[PDB]
Design a protein around this ligand. Structure first.
Ligand SMILES: [Zn+2]
Ligand SMILES: [Zn+2]
Ligand SMILES: [Zn+2]
Ligand SMILES: [Zn+2]
Ligand SMILES: [Zn+2]
Ligand SMILES: [Zn+2]
Ligand SMILES: [Zn+2]
Ligand SMILES: [Zn+2]
Lengths: 367, 367, 367, 367
């Protein structure tokens, strides 16, 4: 069914004011309200007066199958619920494994990514986990990314962390070169996602790769880059050379935060190089609710919405080479509708289907 | 802490009337109320007047990690919640895999069994899954049962079913001989659990094993044996030769049922050879609530409670060689307290800890 | 871009006469010509007056990477050209390997299927090849169909043929059970495609599977079933029990033919159980042109077009569980436009893109 | 059966003087003698007047399956007898392999650990042996510690020794990181036990791990650290940074000894960082009798018993995260009874069972 959203202020994410959006699975037309609209086929209309229309948020780091286990088997966290995603405005998720690559399987990660997609979400996964050498579906990360549609990279590889497998630079280079080449063969981005711990070495290895080899900076995507001011300023040096860094969203649950980090990146013209992620179901427990929460905390510091949205729409889309994050002709019909007063998510659209309409969740399988 | 339950009618499961139970992790003493009780150490007392004290129920067939997936990735079911167990009177669970041995891992089954145990449940697992040759932790089912404490058998191996891997008698015999010998080395029972489908061959192979080889009938534990009157009467022939059969509990959610099956087994003196199981989280969805529900439906047909309890206490304990299912000195302190009028579970004790006291659930990690 | 085809007689494949079709990637609306059509967005119109609009043809058996090699390395055939497909009306192809599973790789089959899809074709592949035990991407055919989107089955497994690996019934049953279960987990059909040679045993094993096991007849898809009258009459017995059989299309390049076979199946009410395939690039050389050629030869025997089209639209779609073969709302916009006089293919549409418009091929990469 | 020890002076190991101990498998109550004791259940009383009650000794390094073989097949030593343990006051043993990882199997180490436990001992094992890369049950040390209850670490890895496999720092770091992460997932300590030879490098690598990585010092447990004054003073530098070191007990069978080592550690406030071990059945032959012998030699130098006991109770318990080494409520009922005059072991209790009562050994299987 073709649908039309009328009377919303649209952030594309660039503010283009009051515009009407016609979509199937892809956006057909953005423009001024028709006012004849005599249409020769069945079609749905949604009155979004009072609402902002945004691109659906992209969370590029979620433990969709559950994580935890750093404190024993009793610290394993539950799997992601799609209902959590819908009421937090997240329409696209990138799932990985974490510390535990033994009791959490890649095949379960894939299966979970496929069931989230069935219920109307958009999903991609990494192969590997914290440990080097990385777990694989097929015996090599290069075969994983060539043969399995949803695999977009390897991650999250731990460096400068007490849970790392203490990988060498040589081991890292082989993994980065394999996912880069596998990316080229398969027409995918080929991302290495680095879990960066609090170790003094920080992102040394990332600088070593770009200085000592021909490997472009765009495959290297460190996260937890707001863990400390010192790490975040190593991050801005990495951005200045063309890199993108990921900051762990503020959880709804205190000196230097992701909020400070985002404000510094803006003042220095590097907000194009910054993503945020929930680390949802991570070790208590990441919520995907952290993404819209974190955007709302940055707005309250005076930053314009067209600019803040980059961290959860334009920037993750560029990193993963997705046709998402943009309301525009031929882009995929993934949108959230926010109340212009309260800024509460009231409607959520993915592939042009309402997952949520005016606070009313669609029908789900175990909810 | 040493505890005492006073003023309950005790089913051990044999009815021994009004008796007092003193326990730590194991039962210290069953007998008449002290009426001096001047005890030289800290100690808890529970007034169970109005309540029946039962042995904790043993569900020998639960998909603790989730199952389903027969209808695509959207039909994968969620993992078991310990809270479901507690309020359904199940203190012991035996976890297996089902149709899906690809996206459901053995290591996850183990990890889940370990976290249920941390929260106060008693857990055992099978190695393998539906498919022959069976998935293993270590490359052989015999090494699995010798090296991994919780592995008590292989299961559930599908026979006479459209989801089976069409196993031969020779393949079955090798698997049964391996789990029997692995059982002997490890001092465990060595159970083969057969998923029996609706195929015309039924439990042919089980009769073939005992008639044509030296393999004792006690390792062979078919389930879904109330699927049809014809299969259940093959089951009673199997019981008459010394076998135990498992019947899928009636789900709280219509000619020949598990209720009819249990009543026939009683009238023919074969209730000692019968277990029930929820198939909890199985493909809608098995609930562990099915076990106490099914016991309550048999009571309403006039069968005595001391006799019905055998299917969820004495019989599963004998099959798996567990020190459970009996309220008696040196047995493990696993009990339920039922209201003598309503027959509602009001308290649940495992290893002598209250998981539930007077409808009040203990503190759990993601609940 | 939204497009509309005006003034064609539409075969859906049921004849619904002069109707107008509005589509993006999926069909939006079939119905009577608008005659106001004032549409508030960019949109393309195609005047198909003089043309029949058909569903795009589905060829379920093509050696897309090349085949041959039965007569030495000089008998290897070239890979499929997408241009061959377009000018033969084939919009969907199912690619497999044949006799040679050594020098022809599965990963090449996948890569070729992906490049045909990029140029605008719709592609699926089998895992395996002629030989039992079958070649795999990941070490098991069950993992292949669960993990790799395009894998829809195993094939083509040779039986009753001098190039077979002389597989046993037990080996066949394990392979059929694995692809059936892998199908259920992955939400795909799980087809076993049998290459049937001229050996006296014919499709004995197929009857053995359905008579002796619980395995439904719909997974079993023999081809070359018009090789002889005797084999084809074994085929009609298989159809009468619910099976679908595949007949090798007549090549444009003499007693009992595929034409006779199709006419017999119609007179006996079994045309619903019949597909044809080119065996394109097969050992001279199969052409995908055989499909439309074979449909044209059946029309010249007086059979109605709505009925003949079933063999290349409805029937392959049902076998592979595809949303193809039907012009109807929500179905994928794959169509051919035929001249009503000459019956020459003049336009070809896949995912709503013109691969060919009025004899003019789109822009291709090495053509 | 509940039991009570009356009239002993209790070292917990802190001296708490004349106290009474009530226990099942765990200690129920420590306190002043009841003097009413009218107890409503069967119960055993032991008159320990004239005896000191100590926590059962923990020997964290025993070749329970036999060792030796450095001088050819004729130098293989016999397996440990449980009777040796009982009459030497050792109630807990940690078993490993040594030089020979070829003819001594891990599965035998496990089996031996299980049979010692059956006869009433408490047992844990390491995976691996001297050689890097280390032998495993399952193909990785991380899977070994997650899947096998008794595996508490990897050991004993040889460094600075002529029998080492000359491991690199990188190989060591991977092994330490794997056992640390496997420890976290499994809720176990994750110990690397280093056999330190007489090579000039000593424990260089241990300092390299803590200085150059985020890996905490508590996983690193070198032994033979009294082999020389020079090595022992490297050991005290390691203790000063938070490490625990192991000293080979003096064998009952001459400048710088374990006695000197323990006295130096006390004078410098580092006795909390010191364990001793028999190296029992090691290459003549370690005896587990060395542990109580070595404690008796330190007492004869004037050190107080509450302090000396730390090396065989509190310190090994902290290293391995065991609920042992403490006489206290909820701790496991493992105790020795010593004659206050002669200091001879006269009774030994494990899990609250008498292995030895007044010089009378319990009934054993091949003794
Ligand atoms: Zn992380
Ligand atoms: Zn993470
Ligand atoms: Zn079943
Ligand atoms: Zn089941
Ligand atoms: Zn063929
Ligand atoms: Zn072929
Ligand atoms: Zn040593
Ligand atoms: Zn040693």
């Amino acid at each position: 069914m073709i649908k039309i959203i009328k009377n919303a202020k649209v952030f594309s994410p660039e503010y283009i004011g009051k515009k009407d959006v016609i979509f199937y699975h892809k956006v057909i037309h953005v423009g001024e309200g028709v006012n004849t609209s005599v249409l020769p086929f069945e079609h749905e209309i949604y009155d979004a007066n009072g609402l902002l229309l945004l691109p659906g948020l992209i969370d590029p780091h979620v433990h969709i199958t559950g994580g935890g286990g750093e404190g024993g088997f009793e610290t394993r966290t539950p799997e992601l619920k799609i209902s959590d995603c819908i009421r937090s405005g997240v329409t696209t998720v990138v799932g990985c494994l974490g510390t535990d690559g033994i009791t959490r399987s890649l095949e379960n990660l894939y299966a979970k990514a496929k069931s989230l997609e069935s219920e109307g979400l958009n999903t991609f996964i990494y192969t590997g986990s914290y440990r080097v050498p990385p777990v694989t579906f097929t015996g090599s990360i290069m075969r994983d990314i060539v043969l399995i549609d949803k695999v977009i990279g390897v991650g999250e590889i731990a460096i400068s962390d007490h849970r790392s497998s203490q990988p060498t630079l040589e081991e890292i280079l082989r993994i980065v070169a394999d996912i880069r080449v596998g990316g080229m063969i398969s027409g995918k981005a080929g991302i290495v996602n680095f879990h960066v711990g609090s170790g003094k070495r920080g992102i040394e290895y990332l600088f070593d790769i770009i200085e000592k080899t021909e490997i472009p900076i765009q495959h290297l995507y460190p996260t937890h880059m707001s863990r400390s001011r010192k790490l975040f300023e190593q991050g801005l040096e990495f951005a200045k050379r063309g890199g993108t860094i990921d900051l762990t969203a503020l959880q709804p649950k205190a000196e230097f935060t992701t909020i400070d980090a985002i404000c510094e990146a803006y003042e220095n013209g590097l907000l194009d190089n910054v993503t945020i992620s929930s680390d949802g179901q991570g070790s208590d427990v990441g919520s995907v609710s952290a993404v819209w929460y974190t955007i709302r905390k940055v707005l309250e510091k005076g930053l314009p919405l067209a600019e803040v949205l980059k961290i959860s729409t334009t920037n993750p889309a560029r990193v993963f080479k997705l046709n998402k994050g943009k309301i525009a002709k031929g882009q995929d019909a993934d949108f959230i509708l926010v109340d212009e007063q309260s800024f509460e998510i009231v409607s959520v659209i993915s592939k042009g289907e309402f997952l949520m309409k005016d606070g009313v969740m669609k029908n789900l399988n175990f909810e």
